Design an enzyme around this catalytic site. Structure first.
Site, short mmCIF file in Angstrom:
data_model
loop_
_atom_site.label_atom_id
_atom_site.label_comp_id
_atom_site.label_asym_id
_atom_site.label_seq_id
_atom_site.Cartn_x
_atom_site.Cartn_y
_atom_site.Cartn_z
N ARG A 1 -1.21 9.93 -13.83
CA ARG A 1 -1.54 11.13 -13.05
C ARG A 1 -1.77 12.30 -13.99
O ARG A 1 -0.85 12.71 -14.70
CB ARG A 1 -0.42 11.50 -12.09
N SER B 6 -1.17 9.56 -4.69
CA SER B 6 -0.19 9.54 -3.60
C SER B 6 -0.02 10.94 -2.94
O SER B 6 -1.01 11.52 -2.50
CB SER B 6 1.13 8.93 -4.09
N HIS B 7 1.19 11.50 -2.90
CA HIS B 7 1.39 12.79 -2.21
C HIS B 7 0.78 13.99 -2.94
O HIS B 7 0.52 15.02 -2.31
CB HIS B 7 2.89 13.03 -1.95
N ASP C 110 1.47 9.51 4.31
CA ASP C 110 1.10 10.21 3.09
C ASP C 110 -0.33 9.84 2.68
O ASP C 110 -1.07 9.20 3.43
CB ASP C 110 2.12 9.93 2.00
N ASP D 256 -1.93 7.85 0.40
CA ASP D 256 -2.46 6.51 0.18
C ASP D 256 -1.95 5.49 1.19
O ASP D 256 -2.33 4.33 1.12
CB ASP D 256 -2.12 6.06 -1.25
N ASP E 206 1.36 4.43 2.03
CA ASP E 206 2.58 3.65 1.83
C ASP E 206 3.82 4.25 2.51
O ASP E 206 4.84 3.56 2.60
CB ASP E 206 2.87 3.52 0.34
N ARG E 207 3.77 5.52 2.96
CA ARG E 207 4.94 6.20 3.51
C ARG E 207 4.65 6.61 4.94
O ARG E 207 3.50 6.66 5.37
CB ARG E 207 5.34 7.45 2.68
N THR F 59 16.44 3.01 -6.92
CA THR F 59 15.14 3.51 -6.53
C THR F 59 14.05 2.92 -7.41
O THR F 59 14.25 2.66 -8.60
CB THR F 59 15.15 5.03 -6.64
N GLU G 33 13.58 2.99 2.42
CA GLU G 33 13.83 4.05 1.47
C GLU G 33 13.99 5.35 2.25
O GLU G 33 13.22 5.64 3.17
CB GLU G 33 12.68 4.20 0.46
N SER H 162 13.15 8.13 1.41
CA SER H 162 12.01 9.00 1.12
C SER H 162 10.75 8.59 1.88
O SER H 162 9.67 8.51 1.31
CB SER H 162 11.78 9.01 -0.39
N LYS I 42 4.87 -0.63 -0.11
CA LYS I 42 5.32 -0.16 1.19
C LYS I 42 4.10 0.16 2.05
O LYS I 42 2.99 0.34 1.56
CB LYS I 42 6.25 1.05 1.05
CA LIG Z 1 2.22 7.05 -1.38
#
Ligand SMILES: [Ca+2]
EC number: 5.4.2.2
Length: 561
Positions: A24, A118-119, A289, A291, A293-294, A358, A377, A379, A390
Site C-alpha cells: 500500500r 481495502s478500507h 468495506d 473490497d 471482506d468485512r 489476529t 473477528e 473488526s 473473509k
Molecule cells: Ca477489506
C-alpha cells in the site's frame, strides 16, 4: 493483437514489502515514482518457476480504486512478456476479494493479484494497494512474501509488452500473439459476480431467501456497499436474483474515490446506512468495506449487532444454512481479542473453539486441516471455509437465512441469544498516534506486573462487583498446522467471571493502542442495560492497572466501538 515483448532496465526500491495485506502506498507514489508498480508486479511474477508460467493462470481484479484499470493493464503487459499463459480479469477490472478467492479455487489457478487497499481511501489523492493471493485462494504467506520482497530490492530489469492493451469492458477471451513466442497470451474477461454468485447459490437456499425478500410481506433490507466493489454483487444477487426491491442497494455503484469518504465499516463511518436504519422502516441493514471482506450488521431502528456477537448468533443458528447441514461444524475460531460470545455457543454445542492471534493465516491453516467452519473477528470480519478470505456479503446471506428460519427481528434474536447464553458486553478503545516510548513502556510495565506471582488472585472492586484475575500473560499461540509460534500478541487479563481486558499495540505512523474490554454477564437484570455503563468497571480497572493516562497523557481514546 500482435505485440512485441520488450525488456526495461529498472532501479529497485527498498520498501516494496507485500505485508500480510498487500503493498500500500499513496496513488501518487504508484504514479510518479518511476516503474514502482512495474517493479513489484515483476518481482512477484518472478516467484513462479518460468517452466510453469505457460500452464499458469492468475486471476486479477480490484475494488474500483482510482488507478486500478491502469494497473491491471500493467499486470497484463508483464504477465504476457514473462510467459504467464492466462489472466482472467473481472469485467472493468471489478473483482471483490471474496470473488478472487472463489475463482482461484474454482479454476485451480496458481493465485491472484488483487488491486485493493481495502478500507483505505481511493482517489488521485488517495491510497492504492496490490495484494498477492496464492493457489489456495488465500493471502500469500510469509515465505512467499519474503521471497517477493527480497526480489523487489534487487530488481534491475523487468519484461513487459509496452503496446499490449486489454479491453476490460467486454466479456470473453482476448488472445495476444507475442512476436517471437509460440504459445499465445490469453486473457479471459469474466463477469464480476457470476462465479461468486454461483458459489453463494450453492451454499444458501436462494429459493427461501427469495421468498423472504419478495412480495408485500417481505422483510425490508438496506445494503450499503459504501461505493465499493460489493455494489454489483448486491444488485445482481440481492436485487435481481432474490428479488429484493431496487432501493435495498444503497451506494452500490463502485466509484474511483468511493464517493469522497473511505470504505471503512463502523457505526460512525457507515452513518449513511445508520441514518436510514434509524427510520425503523427496515428490518435489516448491512454495510461492507471496500473490497468486500468485512461487514456490519444492523437491526430495526439501527439496533447494532457487534461483530463478535454476530459470529456467535450465526454459530447459534448455523444449520439454517444448507452449506453447514451438509458439511457439519468442523469448528469455530475467532481472534484472541474478539469477545467470548462465540465461546459460549461452542461450549454449549461442544465444538472446538480456536483462539487465534489476529491475522488470517491461523484461520486459513485451520480450514485447510478441515477443523474450521466459521470464524469471527471483532473488526467486522466474519468468514467460513467456503473460501480463504473473509466474506462480507456472505455474512449478510447467513443472517438472512437465519432471519428466515427464526422469524424474529434482528433484535429479538440478540435478546434471546443473550438470555440463553448470557451477554458478552464488548467494546474496543483505540488510542491513535500515541507516543511510542510511552506506549511501549506502558505494555512493558503492565507485562512485568502481570508476571508477578501475586497477580492471579488479586481482586478489584467496582461500583458493585469484584473481578478476580484468573490468568494474565502475553498471548502466545502455537500454530497446530505449520508449527509456527506467534508470541507477544497481547496482554490478557482473564477474570474468573468470564470477563477479560486485553491490550495490544498496532503495527500499521506512531503507535496506536487497542484496548479490548469483554465484560460477561449472565443475569437478566444486567443483560439489556446500556453497554458503556456495564463496561465502565472493567474500563476503570483497565486504565488504572495500565496507568495508560500516565504513560500516554490521554484521557480519552480516539475511537470507541
Ligand atoms: Ca477489506
Amino acid at each position: 493483437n500482435m505485440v512485441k515483448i520488450v525488456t526495461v532496465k529498472t532501479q529497485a526500491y527498498q520498501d516494496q514489502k507485500p505485508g500480510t495485506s498487500g503493498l500500500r502506498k499513496r496513488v501518487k507514489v504508484f504514479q510518479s515514482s518511476a516503474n514502482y508498480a512495474e517493479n513489484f508486479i515483476q518481482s512477484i511474477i518472478s516467484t513462479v518457476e518460468p517452466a510453469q508460467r505457460q500452464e499458469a493462470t492468475l486471476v486479477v481484479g480490484g475494488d474500483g480504486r482510482f488507478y486500478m484499470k491502469e494497473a491491471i493493464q500493467l499486470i497484463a503487459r508483464i504477465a504476457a512478456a514473462n510467459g504467464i499463459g492466462r489472466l482472467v480479469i473481472g469485467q472493468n477490472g471489478i473483482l471483490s476479494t471474496p470473488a478472487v478467492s472463489c475463482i482461484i479455487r474454482k479454476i485451480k489457478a496458481i493465485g491472484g493479484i488483487i488491486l485493493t487497499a481495502s478500507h483505505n481511501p481511493g482517489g488521485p489523492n488517495g491510497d492504492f494497494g496490490i495484494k498477492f493471493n496464492i493457489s489456495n485462494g488465500g493471502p500469500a504467506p510469509e515465505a512467499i512474501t519474503d521471497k517477493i520482497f527480497q526480489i523487489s530490492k534487487t530488481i534491475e530489469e523487468y519484461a513487459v509488452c509496452p503496446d499490449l492493451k486489454v479491453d476490460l469492458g467486454v466479456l470473453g477471451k482476448q488472445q495476444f500473439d507475442l512476436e517471437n513466442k509460440f504459445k499465445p497470451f490469453t486473457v479471459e474477461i469474466v463477469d464480476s459476480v457470476e462465479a461468486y454468485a454461483t458459489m453463494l447459490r450453492s451454499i444458501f437456499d436462494f429459493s427461501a431467501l427469495k421468498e423472504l425478500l419478495s412480495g408485500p410481506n417481505r422483510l425490508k433490507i438496506r445494503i450499503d456497499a459504501m461505493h465499493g466493489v460489493v455494489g454489483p454483487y448486491v444488485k445482481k444477487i440481492l436485487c435481481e436474483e432474490l428479488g429484493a426491491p431496487a432501493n435495498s442497494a444503497v451506494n452500490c455503484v463502485p466509484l474511483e474515490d468511493f464517493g469522497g469518504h473511505h470504505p471503512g465499516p463502523n457505526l460512525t463511518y457507515a452513518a449513511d446506512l445508520v441514518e436510514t436504519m434509524k427510520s425503523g422502516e427496515h428490518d435489516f441493514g448491512a454495510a461492507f468495506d471496500g473490497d468486500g471482506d468485512r461487514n456490519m450488521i444492523l437491526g430495526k431502528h439501527g439496533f447494532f449487532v457487534n461483530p463478535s456477537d454476530s459470529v456467535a448468533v450465526i454459530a447459534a443458528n448455523i444449520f439454517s444454512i444448507p452449506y453447514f447441514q451438509q458439511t457439519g461444524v468442523r469448528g469455530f475460531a475467532r481472534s484472541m481479542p474478539t469477545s467470548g460470545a462465540l465461546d459460549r455457543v461452542a461450549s454449549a454445542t461442544k465444538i472446538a473453539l480456536y483462539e487465534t492471534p489476529t491475522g488470517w493465516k491461523f484461520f486459513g491453516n485451520l480450514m485447510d486441516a478441515s477443523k474450521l467452519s466459521l470464524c469471527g473477528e471483532e473488526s467486522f470480519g466474519t468468514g467460513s471455509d467456503h473460501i480463504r478470505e473473509k466474506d462480507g456479503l456472505w455474512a449478510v446471506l447467513a443472517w438472512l437465512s437465519i432471519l428466515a428460519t427464526r422469524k424474529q427481528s434482528v433484535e429479538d434474536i440478540l435478546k434471546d441469544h443473550w438470555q440463553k447464553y448470557g451477554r458478552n458486553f464488548f467494546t474496543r478503545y483505540d488510542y491513535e498516534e500515541v507516543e511510542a516510548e510511552g506506549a511501549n513502556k506502558m505494555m512493558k510495565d503492565l507485562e512485568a506486573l502481570m508476571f508477578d506471582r501475586s497477580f492471579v488472585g488479586k481482586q478489584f472492586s467496582a461500583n458493585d462487583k469484584v473481578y478476580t484475575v484468573e490468568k494474565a500473560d502475553n498471548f502466545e499461540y502455537s500454530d497446530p498446522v505449520d508449527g509456527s509460534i506467534s508470541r507477544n500478541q497481547g496482554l490478557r487479563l482473564i477474570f474468573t467471571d468470564g470477563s477479560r481486558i486485553v491490550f495490544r499495540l498496532s503495527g500499521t505512523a506512531g503507535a496506536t493502542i487497542r484496548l479490548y474490554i469483554d465484560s460477561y454477564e449472565k443475569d437478566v437484570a444486567k443483560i439489556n442495560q446500556d453497554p458503556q455503563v456495564m463496561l465502565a468497571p472493567l474500563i476503570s480497572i483497565a486504565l488504572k492497572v495500565s496507568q495508560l493516562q500516565e504513560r500516554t497523557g490521554r484521557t480519552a481514546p480516539t475511537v470507541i466501538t
